[model samples]
Target: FTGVVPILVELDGDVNGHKFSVRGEGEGDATNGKITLKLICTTGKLPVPWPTLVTTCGYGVQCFARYPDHMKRHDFFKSAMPEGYVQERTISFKDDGTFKTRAEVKFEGDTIVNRIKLKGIDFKEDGNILGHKLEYNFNSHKVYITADKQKNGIKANFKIRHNVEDGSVQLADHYQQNTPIGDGPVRLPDNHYLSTQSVILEDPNEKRDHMVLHEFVTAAGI
Candidate 1:
C-alpha cells in the first residue's frame, strides 16, 4: 500500500498441499503503476479448497459490501447518509419466488428496533441434534461449519446449485465447483483421526475421515 491514501490488498487460496497468497505489487517504477501479482505461502495445515471464501476473499466474501480499514469523516456526514439505514434480515426462499421473513428490523422514527433468529439444520444422519451447533455468517454468505454432539466441529464450505428448469437447490461438493477436487472428505463412531491421502482413505463421493479444524479447550489465558 502507498500513495497519499494508503491501501493494501493481499489475498489467499489453497492448492494440493500448500497455502498461497496473492498480493498486489504496486511497487517499482511507473510501469508498476499497473497492478502486478506476486505470491508467498506456507504448508502443513490441512489444506482448504480455494476459499471463494471470505477467508480467501480478504475479510468476508464479496457478497457483502466491504469498507476500507478506515473511513473518512465526509463519508459519515449527515448529508452524506442515505435516505434509509441498512439492516440485516433473515429470510427463507420459496418455490413460488417469495421470501418468508423469519426475523427483521423495523425502522422507527429515526430509530431501529426488534431482532430475530431463524435456525434450521437438516443435515443430520445422527439422532439428538440438541448438542450440535450450527451458526451462520451473513457477511460470508456461507455456513463455515457443522458441529456434533460431543462438541466436535467440521469446517464446511457448502453451496447450492440452481437449475432454472426445476428451480430448486441442488447438492454440491463445495462452492468452488470449478475444480475437480472440490468434492473432498469423514468419520468414526468414536470420532478418531485418520488419513485421507490416497484412494484408501477416500470414498467415491470424496467423503473421508478427515478433521477440518481444531481449537483447544481453554479459558482465561494469555
Candidate 2:
C-alpha cells in the first residue's frame, strides 16, 4: 500500500509587501516515494536588494524566476506565473526519491537568463534515525544605475534552515552570510512536505544522505 501527504508554504516579507506561497505533495512507500512542491509570489516593491523564492529537501536548494541558465535544467520544478513576467525556478522532491527545479533571473542590467535542472539520489532508510536537516546559502548583489548605466555593487547574504524531526518543519535559520561561509543552525518549519525529510524504514538500522545542486543564468533588462 502507498500513502500521500500534501504540504503548503507561505512567506511574506515585512519590508516589501512581497508574498510567496507554495504547495507540495509527497507519497510514502516501503522505502521511498515522490515529492512535488510549487510556489507563487506577488509582484510589487521588494525590500531586500535581491529577493528570491526558494525550496529544498534535506539534500539541496533550488531557486526560480531569477536566472535562465539555472532554471532550464529543472523546468519540471517550476509553475506558471502571471503575465509575461517569467516566474522564478527552484527544486521540488518527487516520488521514487528524485528532485525537480528551475530558475528565471535578470541581473546586472540587460542581462536575460533562464535555466532548469532535475536531480535524484539513492537513500537508505533507518528506523532509529533521529533527525534530518536542510540549509540554504544565498548571496545577492545590490547595484545602483548611474547616468552611464553602470552598476555600483552592493552585496548581501541570507540563509534558511529546515528541521524534519519536528512535527512540522519550520524555518530554523534565517540570517545573512558573512566572510566565514560555513554551516549554520538547524531550522524547523511548523510543517513539512512529507512526514520526514527522508524515507524511514520500520525495521533495521540504515541511513543515507542524498543531495543535488544546479546553477542558472542571468536574465535580461536588469
Candidate 3:
C-alpha cells in the first residue's frame, strides 16, 4: 500500500524584527525537499586612499546569496566575517527589511580577501570566494582552495579530501607541480590526521598562512 504523498508549499514568517519567506516542494514523508530564496544587499560609499588622502569616487560593494543551498548556509556559518580582514565596518537594516554591511579592510604585504558571489549549480553545497578562494563541498567530503600571488602572496591550488570515518584530511591534487616536493609540499599532496593537533605546510618560498573551515557532522575535530 502507498502511504507517502507529495506536496508543494510556500510560507512566510517574521521573527521579531527579522522577516523571511520560504517556498518549497517535496514529499509528505521524504526529507529531500527543495526551497528557493534571495539575499541582495549593498553598502554605502567611502573615500579612497585613506593613508595618503586622495579623494576619489569609490562606491561600496554589493553582494548577494541566492538559491537553495547557499541561502540557508550564509543565512548561517562559522563566523560573521568571511576572511576576517575588515578593519572599518558599518551595518544598517533598511526600512524595507533588507540590510547592508560596510567594510574597509587593511591591506598590507599579504592578506586573504574573501568576498565573491557564488552560484548554486557550480558549487552545490560549497561556496567559493575571491582572491583566496576557499570552498567546502560537504556531502562529497571534498575541499578546494586557491591562493593568488598578489592577493595571498603565495600561489597554490589544493584539492583536499576529508576522511571523515578515519578523522583525517588529505590533499588530492596540486595545480602545477610534479613529484610533490619539487615545488609543492615536502611529502607530496600532504595529509593531516586528527592525531596531530595542527597541519604544517611548506611551499617553495615558505610563508605560511593557513586557515580551515569545514562543516563536520559527528567527528568534532577541525
Candidate whose TM-score is highest: 2
lDDT, each prediction: 0.22, 0.23, 0.20
Better of 2 and 3 by TM-score: 2
Tell me model 2's lDDT, rounded to 2 decimals. Answer: 0.23
* Residues 40-135, model 1: lDDT tens digits: 223323222221121222211111111122311111111111131211222222221111112222223333222222222232322111121212
Which stretch of 10 consecutive residues in model 3 shows the poorest summed lDDT? 48-57
Q: Is candidate 1 or candidate 3 better by TM-score?
A: 1
lDDT of 3 by residue, 1-222 (tens): 013333222222222222433322222211222111111111211111010000000111101111133223221111222222221111111111111222231211232122221111111122111111222222232222122333321122333332222343323332211111122222111221111011212234422221111111111112
Name the candidate, 2 or 3, with the larger lDDT value.
2
Ranking by lDDT: 2, 1, 3
Measured over all alpha carbons after superposition, the RMSD of each candidate to the real structure, in angstroms, is 21.9, 20.1, 23.2
Off by over 4 Å in 2: 15-33, 43-52, 55-222
lDDT of 2 at 166: 35
Q: Which candidate order results from sorting by TM-score in descending order?
A: 2, 1, 3
**Candidate 2 structure, TM-score to reference:** 0.20
